[PDB]
């Protein structure tokens, strides 16, 4: 059965100390497997963006890793999913201390 | 030098009948072994007679002895060590 994507649960707010590593991961479902997009500031995040951002997608999980976090990394990140049957989105506000 | 927290096993959502035991399960790695804390609605949870946090090495659980409709919602697992932090949220759905 064709089913639109669903983001399972995502924290509303997360924090990290400047200079450290942040990992936020998130499960999802959808048939067919959805296309995953992470963005901040309305711009898609690409793997090895700034030499520090990494994205690991599987068929039911996405993991965003930010290495050596900088102050300017802070902001409202959106995870979006799409497939032929619909879309979903959820936000997480990433705070850099401090 | 160490390495930041990560999930070997991610906490998947649980769907449980009111009155049944429910457990969110994950496995968290990292060096040093991360301290894992669960919160709900932005508030850190306290162990009790009906809510426990079975921890066995990397194995971590949030255990509800007998789920009630009021237990439904999103729970956040936050793991921390010297190198960084990892976050994972999971939903409990409680059916009549």
UniProtKB/Swiss-Prot annotation, chain A:
It comes from the Eukaryota. Autophosphorylated. Isoforms 3, 7 and 8 are expressed in cardiac muscle. Isoform 4 is expressed in vertebrate skeletal muscle. Isoform 6 is expressed in skeletal muscle (at protein level). It is found in: Cytoplasm; Nucleus. Residues 5-93 form the Ig-like domain. Interacts with MYOM1, MYOM2, tropomyosin and myosin. Interacts with actin, primarily via the PEVK domains and with MYPN. Interacts with FHL2, NEB, CRYAB, LMNA/lamin-A and LMNB/lamin-B. Interacts with TCAP/telethonin and/or ANK1 isoform Mu17/ank1.5, via the first two N-terminal immunoglobulin domains. Interacts with TRIM63 and TRIM55, through several domains including immunoglobulin domains 141 and 142. Interacts with ANKRD1, ANKRD2 and ANKRD23, via the region between immunoglobulin domains 77 and 78 and interacts with CAPN3, via immunoglobulin domain 79. Belongs to the protein kinase superfamily. CAMK Ser/Thr protein kinase family. It is linked to Myopathy, myofibrillar, 9, with early respiratory failure: An autosomal dominant myopathy characterized by adulthood onset of weakness in proximal, distal, axial and respiratory muscles. Pelvic girdle weakness, foot drop and neck weakness are the main symptoms at onset, but ultimately the weakness usually involves the proximal compartment of both upper and lower limbs. Additional features include variable degrees of Achilles tendon contractures, spinal rigidity and muscle hypertrophy. Respiratory involvement often leads to requirement for non-invasive ventilation support. Cardiomyopathy, familial hypertrophic, 9: A hereditary heart disorder characterized by ventricular hypertrophy, which is usually asymmetric and often involves the interventricular septum. The symptoms include dyspnea, syncope, collapse, palpitations, and chest pain. They can be readily provoked by exercise. The disorder has inter- and intrafamilial variability ranging from benign to malignant forms with high risk of cardiac failure and sudden cardiac death. Key component in the assembly and functioning of vertebrate striated muscles. By providing connections at the level of individual microfilaments, it contributes to the fine balance of forces between the two halves of the sarcomere. The size and extensibility of the cross-links are the main determinants of sarcomere extensibility properties of muscle. In non-muscle cells, seems to play a role in chromosome condensation and chromosome segregation during mitosis. Might link the lamina network to chromatin or nuclear actin, or both during interphase. This is Titin. It comes from Homo sapiens. The gene is TTN.
From Swiss-Prot, chain B:
It comes from the Eukaryota. It is found in: Cytoplasm; Cytoplasm, Cytoskeleton, Microtubule organizing center, Centrosome; Cytoplasm, Perinuclear region; Golgi apparatus. Residues 5-93 form the Ig-like domain. Residues 10-12, 78-87 are annotated as: Interaction with TTN. Widely expressed, with predominant levels found in the heart. The modification Phosphoserine is found at residue 3. Signal peptide: none annotated. Disulfide bonds join 26-77. Coiled coil: none annotated. Changing residue 10 to R: Diminishes binding affinity for TTN. It is linked to 3M syndrome 2: An autosomal recessive disorder characterized by severe pre- and postnatal growth retardation, facial dysmorphism, large head circumference, and normal intelligence and endocrine function. Skeletal changes include long slender tubular bones and tall vertebral bodies. Component of the 3M complex, composed of core components CUL7, CCDC8 and OBSL1. Interacts with CCDC8. Interacts with CUL7; the interaction is direct. Interacts with FBXW8. Interacts (via N-terminal Ig-like domain) with TTN/titin (via C-terminal Ig-like domain); the interaction is direct. Core component of the 3M complex, a complex required to regulate microtubule dynamics and genome integrity. It is unclear how the 3M complex regulates microtubules, it could act by controlling the level of a microtubule stabilizer. Acts as a regulator of the Cul7-RING(FBXW8) ubiquitin-protein ligase, playing a critical role in the ubiquitin ligase pathway that regulates Golgi morphogenesis and dendrite patterning in brain. Required to localize CUL7 to the Golgi apparatus in neurons. This is Obscurin-like protein 1. The gene is OBSL1.
């Amino acid at each position: 059965p064709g089913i639109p994507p669903k983001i399972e649960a995502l924290p509303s707010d997360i924090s990290i100390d400047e200079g450290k590593v942040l990992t936020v991961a998130c499960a999802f479902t959808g048939e067919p497997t959805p296309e995953v997009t992470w963005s901040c500031g309305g711009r898609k995040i690409h793997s090895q963006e700034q030499g520090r951002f990494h994205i690991e997608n599987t068929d039911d999980l996405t993991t965003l890793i930010i290495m050596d976090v900088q102050k300017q990394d802070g902001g409202l990140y959106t995870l979006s999913l799409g497939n032929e049957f619909g879309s979903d989105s959820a936000t997480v506000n990433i705070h850099i201390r401090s | 030098q160490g390495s930041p927290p990560c999930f070997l096993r991610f906490p998947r959502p649980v769907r449980v009948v009111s009155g049944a035991e429910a457990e969110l399960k994950c496995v968290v790695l990292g060096e040093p072994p991360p301290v894992v804390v669960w919160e709900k609605g932005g508030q850190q949870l306290a162990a009790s007679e009906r809510l426990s946090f079975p921890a066995d090495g990397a194995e971590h659980g949030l255990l509800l002895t007998a789920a009630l409709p009021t237990d439904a919602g999103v729970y956040v697992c936050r793991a921390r060590n010297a190198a960084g932090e990892a976050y994972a949220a999971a939903a409990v759905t409680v059916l009549e």
